Amino acid sequence: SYALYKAFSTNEQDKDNWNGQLKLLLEWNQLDLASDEIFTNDRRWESADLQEVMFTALIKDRPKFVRLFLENGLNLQKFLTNEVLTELFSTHFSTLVYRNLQIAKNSYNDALLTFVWKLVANFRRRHPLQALFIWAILQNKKELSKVIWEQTKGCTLAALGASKLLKTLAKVKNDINAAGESEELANEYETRAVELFTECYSNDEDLAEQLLVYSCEAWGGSNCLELAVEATDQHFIAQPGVQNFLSKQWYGEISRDTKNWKIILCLFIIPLVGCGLVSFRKKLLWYYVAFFTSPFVVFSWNVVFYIAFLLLFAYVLLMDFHSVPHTPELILYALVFVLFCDEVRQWYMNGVNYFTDLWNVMDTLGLFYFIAGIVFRLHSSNKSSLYSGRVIFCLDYIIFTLRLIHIFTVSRNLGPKIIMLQRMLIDVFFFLFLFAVWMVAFGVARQGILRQNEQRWRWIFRSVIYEPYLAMFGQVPS
């Protein structure tokens, strides 16, 4: 390249042809030479004709040259039109990347990937730099993307959305090499988002908490915190800045540096609100509302109400259950109506993804078994339907009581252990598989050796399944 530049330069006719020298030094990777003796003397810069060389540097993976061009002047929004994007996504877009995009859209669909599928369908047939950044990032370019990422405004949103896209495209099973590179690039941009927000928080807290909440006029139609959630990027939320934001939004009006026992003590004794025991940092009726508004105490009031509801359910079910409903059954139906209204509200304000949560599944299940218990219970003067209604309410009480576990996950102490508890199910299922195999083998062998031609199915299953099952708690079959 240096030999060809010394031949091209000393013809004394094309010394004025800096465009030809620049295209020659772009076709080769000569960064230092083009910087040292084209842009040195500042004797002729136009700033408007650099678009052909810019498109050439984009399509040929020349990131240091686009860095040099932006350093010496070009506006990308001035550079980018819809014809440029259709030439990128139509001609300069690969076909194997598009096939991986199809496989990801078929098997692992997501809201952001539906958005990028819609925009790539737009451009294969207004936020310029973000779409160019998406183009660069799903090609696995890895160094043109950093150059454009330094030019963007919403840089945290850009890094989080890019991490989400590449983590989804790393799940496609064919062409595992591209999946590996997209995984590495995903990890790099999520590291970048975390390390930028820790600086933006370690200077100014109020402006970082201003950053966390914005939608960027439909970047991808969502938020910085929401994009960190939807990618299951749990290191962006386990950092002390977002944790401090969440705790300051959790205690609300009450300052965080007051002890918890003062707060629950003022919860139980209501007219104690007007005293100097709680700190409202973060005249009297404002103290009243600033206490009874915060998330902490509405949660705590709610769990006290729920424990009282369970005691009422237990009293009704064990000690007062007659052929006609007495007064505490009617109070019980009123409280279950309150719970039903809350859950149908939460279904309305969530939609279908409400049913994604397991607790809302068993929550709907418990409400359904309750109303089934009512419709068996009201048929009086029939002993079987009344006993059946009470049996349905007992199994329903099992469901309502086991929901208290998922209630108490918010605690600093019990919380991480209840979350740990669901990571054990594969060990439990391995145990139950091996135990069921040994149990069936021993039970059928013992029943076959001892007896002869049992014809009752109940006394088959009491002697093959049930008694070898009790031998797990140390019973020694008799």
């Binding site: 405004k153 200077n203 006029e217 959630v229 969440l246 998330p295 509405v298 709610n302 918010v410 991480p416």
Partner: protein, 88 residues
């Protein structure tokens, strides 16, 4: 004896793995309870049904410069962080 004391060992191994990730998963799950309790503007639980009627009342009757300012604020620590990367 064998099959129960094997389950003990597997539980102990899984606890020994997942505990350094466990606090991260917990305080990630903390987001969902904070958002479902800070989303609704609500009264005490057994009174919420009253506010339900109030929402029925609704169905009875029926570029920004500081965002540019905070993005322009963000750009400065972006530049500072890039300087720190190339400083290390």
């Amino acid at each position: 004896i064998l099959l129960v004391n094997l389950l003990v060992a597997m539980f102990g191994y899984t606890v020994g793995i997942v505990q350094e990730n466990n606090d991260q998963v917990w305080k990630f799950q903390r987001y969902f309870l904070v958002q479902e309790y800070c989303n609704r503007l609500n009264i005490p639980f057994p009174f919420v049904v009253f506010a339900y009627f109030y929402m029925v009342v609704k169905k009875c009757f029926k570029f920004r410069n500081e965002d540019n300012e905070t993005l322009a604020w963000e750009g400065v620590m972006k530049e500072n962080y890039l300087v720190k990367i190339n400083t290390k």
